[PDB]
Amino acid sequence: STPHLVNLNEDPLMSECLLYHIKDGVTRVGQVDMDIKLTGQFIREQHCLFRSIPQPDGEVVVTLEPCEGAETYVNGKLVTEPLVLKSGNRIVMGKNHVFRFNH
C-alpha cells in the first residue's frame, strides 16, 4: 500500500490533521511552507522531511531526516541523523505531535 502517517494524539485540534499518505518523493514537515504543517511551540519552520524512494519490486522505502535544531524521536530515541523508518514506528515531533508510521 501507500505508507501512512497516522495521528496518535488523543485530542487533536479541529485544524489538526489526522492522517497523511506519504507519497513518492520528499514530504517536508514544519510550519512555514511545508507539505505537512504542524503548529506546536517546538515545531521548527523546517522540522524534518520524509523521503519515499521505490525499490526494484515497486515496494517503497521511507526515510526520515531531522533538521538542525528540530527535535524528532522514533520509538523513543531522539533522531539526530537520517534513518530508515519501519511499519509500526512511533514518531514524535516537537513535544505535541505523535504519529505512527504505517506501511
Ligand SMILES: [Cl-]
Ligand atoms: Cl511541539
Ligand code: NI
Ligand atoms: Ni491509505
